[PDB]
Design a protein around this ligand. Structure first.
Ligand SMILES: [Zn+2]
Ligand SMILES: [Zn+2]
Length: 98
């Protein structure tokens, strides 16, 4: 076979929704809005963080309201947030801009 047509651009082609951008301030302890008034998730453990993208996985089950996965090892976002994501899946209208 070809075994590699071409690698001009080094980047995959896909998109996920279970990815929360970890805050930069909180990490050091500067964020005042907190995971509550802050859109970015605040990892308390700060262990499942990738220094490559700086994003944490999102528990799909939990989002639905029932999280009983096997040894759930994903971040659990707050209520306000949990929704922000849900809406995305369920076709709906968007609010104005800030
Ligand atoms: Zn924050
Ligand atoms: Zn979970």
């Amino acid at each position: 076979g070809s075994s590699g047509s071409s690698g001009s651009t080094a980047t995959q082609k896909l998109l996920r929704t279970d990815k929360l951008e970890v805050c930069r301030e909180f990490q050091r302890g500067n964020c005042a809005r907190g995971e509550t008034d802050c859109r970015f998730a605040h990892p308390a453990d700060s262990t499942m963080i990738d220094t490559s993208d700086n994003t944490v996985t999102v528990c799909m089950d939990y989002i639905k309201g029932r999280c009983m996965r096997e040894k759930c090892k994903y971040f659990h976002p707050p209520a306000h947030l949990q929704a922000k994501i849900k809406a995305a899946q369920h076709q709906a209208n968007q609010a104005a801009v800030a």
